[PDB]
RNA sequence: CGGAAGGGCACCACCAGGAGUGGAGCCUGCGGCGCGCUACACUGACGGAGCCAGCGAGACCUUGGCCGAGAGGUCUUGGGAAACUCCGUCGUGCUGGGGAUAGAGCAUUGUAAUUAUUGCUCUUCAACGAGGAAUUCCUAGUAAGCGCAAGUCAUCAGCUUGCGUUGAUUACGUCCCUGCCCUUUGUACACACCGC
C-alpha cells in the first residue's frame, strides 16, 4: 500500500568460497527443501514395503505361480 | 552455568515485555 | 533384449532421424507441460 | 522324471539344503565328498547317521548337500540334520514305510536332534 | 470391508501416496461489448415485467422509449403468453395489455411452460435481444450470461443495466 | 441356535419347542436321597 | 500366531485412533460441561485386576556399574526380575517375554558405567517410553546402608499437568504395584520441574507431631524423549510424541 | 551467544529442601496418588 | 507400646562354584573414588595352509591391470571377520610373552611455519613373574572369549548401540544365618483338618 521501491529493492545471493570450489555448489534453502522432500518420499515407500514384508502371510496362492558378442546376440 | 543463567535471563525479559505490551494494548482499548 | 538386425545405409540414418525427432518432441512436450503446471 | 526329494537342516544360523535321488551311491557336500568336511574332528559327528543305519541304503541313494550360514560347529550339525531328514524322507516316499519307521526309530533312539530341530528359545525366571 | 481394515488401508494409502460440443463465442462480442445491439432494439418481455409495469403505471412502448431513447420492439413468446393466461382473471388487464398490435409475438417449440428456461435459451442462442424483467433468479442467470443487456422495472420508470450506450 | 448352525462344524439339532399333574424326567438327585440328608451339618 | 499378532496390532492402532478422536470430542464437549453446572485402554483392561510383573534387563555386555544399577531398579520396583541379556536378539527377547506373560520390560543403557537411557515397554503391543536419565546416584555409590525395605510402596506425583503428563503418570503408575497398604512405609516420589522429572525413595514415620522422612534408593533425574505406539522390537511403529530439539523455542518449551 | 536445549538442572540444597518439604506436605495430608484396587 | 507363634520370599541370604575390580601399562567418567582395554606366555608365541556368518543401503566407494618389501601411488569399470582347524619352529629362560621409550629411514595429507599429522620398515626391549586389605556381579545358548557393521533429534566417537560366531563349571534345595514380608475372626460352600 505505502512502500518505496528502494524498500522493495532486491537481495542477491552470494556464492561458494573460491578456495573451496572442489566441493561444489553451496546449497541454499530451495535446494535443501527439494532434497528433503525427495528423501521423505523414499523413506515413506520404504516403510510401506517393510510393513508389507512384515505382514506377508505366507499362504497366498496366486495362479501365476505355475511358471564375439554381436554374433552371440544375432544367434540368440 | 552461564548457559543456565542466560536462558533464565532471556525468559525473564520476554515475560516482562509480554506483560508490558498486554498492558499497552489494554490501555489503548479502554482509553 | 531387442532383435539384432543388420541395416544398410539409408534405413540406418532414417532411424537416427526418427530418434532425433522423437527426442525433440519429448523435450517440447515436457516444457509445455511444465509451463502449464506453473500456470 | 527322476525321483528326488529335498530337505532342510537348520542349526543356529546354518541352513543345509539336501537333495536326495536314486543313483550310484555318492554323498557329496558343497561339491566335495563327505570325507573332506572342514573341522576334521567332527567328521565322525557327520558320519553318525550313515554308520548308525548302515551303508547299503546310501549305496543305493545319491545325495547332494549345500550349506550356507553359521560357523563350523553349526554347519556340521546342520549337515547331519539335513542328511537324516533327506534319507528318511526318500525312504518314506519311494520305498517301504516299514523301513521308514525302522529308520526313524533307530535315529531317534540314538539322538532325536538328528530329525527335529532344537530351537533353544529363551525363558525368564 | 471392515472398519479396522478401512483404517489400515487409509493409513497405507497416505503412506504410499506420500463427441463433445463447445459452443462458439458469438461474432457479436468484443470482449464484453455485444456490438450487435444497435437501435431499434428488440426486447424480450417477461410476465413479472408486465405486472410491475401495470403496478407502476408506466406504458410498455412509450416508457421503454423514455428509457432507451430509441424505438423498441417488444417481443412475447408463447411461454410468456401462456403464463399470463394461466394467471388468469385477476391479471385480465395485463393480458389485454400484452395482447396488442405492436407486441410482435414470436413462437416457440417447447414441451412445457417454463418461461425462464425459454428466455434463457433464447438469449443463449442469439444475443441480439435485451431482456426485460424484475425477477431475481432470471436476473442472476442472465447476469452470469456475458454481454446481454438487462432491463428491470423499478421506481418511476424502467432501468437498464448492461448497455454501454444508455445515454 | 441359528448362530451355532452357521458357525459350527458338526451337526446340531433344533433345541426345543415353544394344567395337569406333571412328571419331571430328569432329577438332580438320586431320587432316594432325602433333602435333610443332603444338607450339610454345618449349614443347618 | 504371527497372524494373531498382526491382527491385534492392527486393532490396537484402530483403538488408539478412536481414543484420540474421542478425546478431541471430549475437549469439545468440556465447554458444555461448565455451562449447566479415567485411565488408558490397556491399563483399563488390567488396571487393578492383575498385579504387574516387570523384567529389568541390561543393554548388552554390560559393565559392573550398569549391572549394579539394574539391580537397584529391580529392588526399587516390586514384582521385578533382573535379566542379563547376552546374545539375545530383540525380537526373540520380546517374543520370550510375551510368551512368558510379562506386564512390562525396562531395558537400560549406559556410557562407560554411567546410566543415561532407560526404555520401558508395555508388552501386549503397548507403548514404549524412552527416557534419558542423567544424574544417577546409586546405593552402591553411597554406602553400605542396609537394604531396601521392599514393602509395597506408596506413590507421589508432583506437577503433572498436560495430556503428556497424564500418559506418563499412567504408565509409571501401572508399572508400580496396585492397592498398597495404608501404613505402607516407603514412598516413591516423582517430582516434575520443567520437563526434568526426578525420582526418590523415601521412608517416613509419623512423629509425635508430624512426619520425618529418610531419603534412600537411587537418585536420578530422567526426562522423556520418545513415546512410540508399538513395542520396542519394531523401530517402525508410529510415534505418539517425539521430543523436538532443533526448534526455535527448544530452550523455553515445557512438556516438549 | 545462544544455546539450543534445556540445561540439565544441578541438584542443590535449596531445591532438595523444597522437594522434601513437598513430600512432607503430601504425607502429612496423606493425600497422594496410588493405584487403588478395582472394586466389584 | 512391646513380645510370642505359624508361613512365604531373596545370588542385598545360606550352600557350590565361576568371573571381575583393587597390583603393572593405556584409556576414560567423577576429586582420592570409579568404568573399560592389553598383558603377565606352552590350553602359548611365531610361520605356512584351510576356510564359515549376520545386522546394515541419502569426485564416493570401487572390479580389473601396473609398478613399489611395505606404506603407497598409477591406468582402466558400475552406480568371503576373528577366535578356530592342520602341519611346522621355539621351548621354560622376565626367553621369541610384553611392546613402553628412543633413534634412523621411507611414503601419504593439509599447508608454507624447514608446520603438524598418519601409515610402513629396521634397530633399542622398561614395567609386568597372576595381583593384599577388601570389594562387586552371576544360575543356560547364561558367565566368559572373538570379531563385523551403523552412528538414523536424548547419550556416545581411543565410544555407544545392534549383529553373528565359540560356549561351559556349579546350585536349581533350605529358611539354619542375614534380612524383607504376611497372618494370628476358614468366612468361603461340601469331605477332611484345625479349634480361644
Ligand atoms: Zn418458448
CA distance G3 to A57: 7
Closest-CA residue to E97 (of E146, E50, E159): E50
For residue H1, what is its C-alpha cell? 551467544
Q: Which residue of G has its CA nearest to E10?
A: G14
Q: Which residue of E has its CA nearest to A42?
A: E18
Instruction: Tell the burial category of C20 from Cβ atoms under 10 Å away from its Cβ (0-12, 13-18, 19+).
Output: exposed
Could you give the C-alpha distances from A22 to A25, A28, E18, G160, in angstroms and in order? 9, 17, 35, 54
Considering only residues 62-91 of protein chain G, which place a Cβ less than 7 A from any atom of strand I? 63-65, 67-68, 70-71, 75, 82, 84, 86-91
Protein-proximal nucleotides of chain I (any atom < 7 Å from a CB) = 11-13, 20, 28-29, 34-36, 50-54, 58-59, 81-86, 136-145, 153-156, 159-167, 179-182, 189-191
Peptide bond just before H37 cis, omega within 30 deg: no
Closest-CA residue to D17 (of D83, D98, D116): D83
Q: Cβ–Cβ contacts within 10 Å for residue G29, how many?
A: 10
Tell me the longest C-alpha to C-alpha distance in chain E.
76
CA distance G178 to G153: 9
∠ Cα A28 A32 A35 (to 5°): 145
User: What single DSSP character describes residue G137?
Assistant: B
Asked if D20 and D5 touch (Cβ cutoff 8 Å), the reply is yes
Which single residue is written with the C-alpha cell 483403538? G15
N- to C-terminal Cα distance for chain G? 38
Top CATH class, D1-125: alpha beta
CA distance C7 to C15: 10
3-class DSSP assignment, residue A58:
coil
For residue F31, what is its C-alpha cell? 431320587
- Alpha carbon of G82: minimum distance to chain D alpha carbons (Å): 9
Q: Cβ–Cβ contacts within 10 Å for residue D63, how many?
A: 22
Cα dihedral sign for G35, G40, G46, G51?
negative
Nearest 10 degrees: CA dihedral of G38, G44, G50, G51?
A: -60
CA distance E50 to E66: 16
Closest-CA residue to H26 (of G230, G159, A16): G159
CA distance G180 to C25: 81
Whole-number distance in Å between E50 CA and I82 C1' = 106
3-class DSSP assignment, residue E86:
helix
3-class DSSP assignment, residue D61:
strand
Instruction: Tell the burial category of G223 from Cβ atoms under 10 Å away from its Cβ (0-12, 13-18, 19+).
Output: middle
Instruction: Give every CB contact of residue C6 below 8 A, 6+ residues apart in sequence.
Output: A74
Kindly state whether B11 is in contact with chain G, defined as any CB-CB distance less than 8 angstroms. yes
Asked if E32 and E101 touch (Cβ cutoff 8 Å), the reply is no
CA distance D46 to D34: 8
3-class DSSP assignment, residue E126:
coil
CA distance G196 to G194: 6
Which single residue is written with the C-alpha cell 527416557? G131
Whole-number distance in Å between G65 CA and I135 C1' = 13
| Proximity of residue D41 CB to strand I below 7 A | yes
Which single residue is written with the C-alpha cell 523384567? G55
For residue E119, what is its C-alpha cell? 428466455
Chain centroid offset of residue H18 CA? 9
Asked if G42 and G126 touch (Cβ cutoff 8 Å), the reply is yes
CA distance G254 to A31: 33
- Alpha carbon of G43: minimum distance to chain H alpha carbons (Å): 11
Domain segments of chain D as ranges: 1-125
CA distance G157 to G168: 10
- Alpha carbon of A12: minimum distance to chain G alpha carbons (Å): 26
For residue G27, what is its C-alpha cell? 475437549
CA distance E83 to D43: 110
For chain F, helix (H) and strand (E) counts, in that order, are: 2, 0
Dist. CA C3 → ligand 1 center (Å): 69
User: What single DSSP character describes residue G124?
Assistant: T
Stated resolution in angstroms: 3.8
Q: In DSSP terms, which residues pair with E157 in a beta bridge?
A: E154
3-class DSSP assignment, residue C15:
helix
Whole-number distance in Å between G127 CA and I25 C1' = 48
3-class DSSP assignment, residue G188:
strand
CA distance D27 to D22: 12
Asked if D20 and D93 touch (Cβ cutoff 8 Å), the reply is no
CA distance G187 to G53: 19
For residue E93, what is its C-alpha cell? 388487464
Q: Cβ–Cβ contacts within 10 Å for residue A11, how many?
A: 4
Amino acid at each position: 500500500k505505502l512502500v518505496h521501491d528502494v524498500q522493495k529493492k532486491q537481495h542477491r545471493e552470494r556464492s561458494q568460497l573460491t578456495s573451496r570450489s572442489r566441493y561444489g555448489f553451496l546449497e541454499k534453502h530451495k535446494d535443501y527443501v527439494k532434497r528433503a522432500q525427495d528423501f521423505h518420499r523414499k523413506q515413506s515407500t520404504l516403510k510401506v514395503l517393510r510393513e508389507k514384508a512384515k505382514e506377508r502371510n505366507p499362504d497366498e496362492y496366486y495362479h501365476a505361480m505355475h511358471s564375439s558378442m554381436d554374433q552371440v546376440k544375432l544367434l540368440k | 552455568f552461564e548457559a543456565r543463567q542466560r536462558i533464565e535471563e532471556k525468559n525473564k525479559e520476554s515475560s516482562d515485555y509480554h506483560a508490558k505490551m498486554a498492558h499497552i494494548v489494554n490501555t489503548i482499548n479502554t482509553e | 533384449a531387442k532383435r539384432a538386425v543388420v541395416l544398410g545405409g539409408d534405413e540406418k540414418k532414417a532411424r537416427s532421424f526418427i530418434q532425433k525427432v522423437l527426442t525433440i518432441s519429448k523435450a517440447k512436450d515436457s516444457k509445455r507441460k511444465e509451463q502449464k503446471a506453473s500456470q | 522324471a527322476v525321483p528326488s526329494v529335498q530337505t532342510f537342516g537348520k542349526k543356529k544360523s546354518a541352513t543345509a539344503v539336501a537333495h536326495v535321488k536314486a543313483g550310484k551311491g555318492l554323498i557329496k557336500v558343497n561339491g566335495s565328498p563327505i570325507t573332506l568336511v572342514e573341522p576334521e574332528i567332527l567328521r565322525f559327528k557327520v558320519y553318525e547317521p550313515l554308520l548308525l543305519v548302515g551303508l547299503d541304503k546310501f549305496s543305493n541313494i545319491d545325495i547332494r548337500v549345500r550349506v550356507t550360514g553359521g560357523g563350523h560347529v553349526s554347519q556340521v550339525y546342520a549337515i547331519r540334520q539335513a542328511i537324516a531328514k533327506g534319507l528318511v524322507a526318500y525312504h518314506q516316499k519311494y520305498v517301504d514305510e516299514q523301513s521308514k519307521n525302522e529308520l526313524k526309530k533307530a535315529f531317534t533312539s540314538y539322538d532325536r536332534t538328528l530329525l527335529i530341530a532344537d530351537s533353544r528359545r529363551p525363558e525368564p525366571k | 470391508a471392515k472398519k479396522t481394515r478401512k483404517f489400515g488401508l487409509v493409513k497405507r494409502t497416505l503412506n504410499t501416496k506420500k463427441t463433445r460440443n463447445i459452443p462458439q463465442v458469438s461474432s457479436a462480442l468484443f470482449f464484453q461489448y455485444n456490438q450487435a445491439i444497435k437501435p431499434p432494439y428488440q426486447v424480450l418481455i417477461d410476465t413479472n415485467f408486465i405486472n410491475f409495469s401495470i403496478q407502476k403505471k408506466v406504458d410498455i412502448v412509450r416508457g421503454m422509449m423514455d428509457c432507451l431513447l430509441a424505438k423498441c420492439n417488444p417481443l412475447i413468446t408463447d411461454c410468456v403468453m401462456a403464463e399470463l393466461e394461466k394467471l388468469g382473471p385477476k391479471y385480465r388487464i395485463a393480458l389485454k395489455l400484452a395482447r396488442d398490435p405492436r407486441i410482435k409475438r414470436l413462437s416457440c417449440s417447447h414441451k412445457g411452460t417454463y418461461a425462464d428456461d425459454c428466455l434463457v435459451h433464447r438469449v443463449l442462442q442469439h444475443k441480439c435481444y435485451i431482456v426485460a424483467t424484475n425477477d431475481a433468479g432470471l436476473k442472476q442467470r442472465i447476469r452470469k450470461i456475458p454481454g446481454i443487456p438487462l432491463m428491470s422495472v423499478g421506481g418511476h420508470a424502467y432501468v437498464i443495466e448492461k448497455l454501454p450506450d444508455v445515454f | 441356535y441359528k448362530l451355532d448352525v452357521l458357525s459350527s462344524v458338526h451337526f446340531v439339532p433344533k433345541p426345543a419347542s415353544t394344567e395337569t399333574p406333571t412328571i419331571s424326567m430328569e432329577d438332580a438327585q438320586p431320587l432316594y436321597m432325602s433333602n435333610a440328608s443332603s444338607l450339610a451339618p454345618q449349614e443347618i | 500366531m504371527l497372524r494373531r499378532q498382526a491382527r491385534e496390532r492392527r486393532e490396537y492402532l484402530y483403538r488408539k485412533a478412536q481414543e484420540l478422536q474421542d478425546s478431541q470430542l471430549q475437549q469439545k464437549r468440556q465447554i458444555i460441561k461448565q455451562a449447566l453446572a479415567q485411565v488408558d485402554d490397556e491399563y483399563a483392561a488390567t488396571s487393578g485386576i492383575m498385579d504387574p510383573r516387570i523384567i529389568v534387563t541390561t543393554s548388552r555386555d554390560p559393565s559392573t556399574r550398569l549391572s549394579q544399577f539394574a539391580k537397584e531398579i529391580k529392588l526399587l520396583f516390586p514384582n521385578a526380575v533382573r535379566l542379563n541379556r547376552g546374545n539375545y536378539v530383540m525380537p526373540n527377547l520380546v517374543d520370550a517375554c510375551k510368551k512368558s506373560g510379562t506386564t512390562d520390560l525396562v531395558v537400560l543403557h549406559e556410557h562407560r558405567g554411567v546410566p543415561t537411557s532407560l526404555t520401558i515397554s508395555h508388552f501386549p503391543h503397548g507403548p514404549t517410553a524412552q527416557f534419558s536419565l542423567h544424574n544417577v546416584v546409586m546405593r552402591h555409590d553411597i554406602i553400605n546402608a542396609g537394604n531396601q525395605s521392599e514393602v509395597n510402596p506408596h506413590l507421589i506425583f508432583d506437577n503433572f499437568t498436560t495430556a503428556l503428563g497424564k500418559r506418563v503418570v499412567c504408565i509409571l503408575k501401572h508399572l508400580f504395584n496396585a492397592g498398597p497398604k495404608k501404613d505402607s512405609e516407603r514412598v516413591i516420589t516423582f517430582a516434575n520441574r520443567g520437563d526434568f522429572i526426578s525420582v526418590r525413595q523415601h521412608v517416613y514415620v509419623r512423629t509425635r507431631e508430624g512426619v520425618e522422612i529418610a531419603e534412600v534408593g537411587p537418585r536420578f533425574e530422567m526426562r522423556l524423549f520418545e513415546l512410540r505406539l508399538g513395542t520396542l522390537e519394531n523401530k517402525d511403529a508410529d510415534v505418539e510424541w517425539q521430543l523436538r530439539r532443533f526448534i526455535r523455542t527448544a530452550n523455553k518449551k515445557d512438556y516438549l | 551467544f545462544d544455546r539450543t536445549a534445556k540445561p540439565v538442572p544441578v541438584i542443590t540444597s535449596e531445591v532438595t529442601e523444597s522437594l522434601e518439604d513437598m513430600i512432607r506436605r503430601r504425607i502429612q495430608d496423606s493425600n497422594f496418588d496410588d493405584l487403588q484396587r478395582r472394586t466389584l
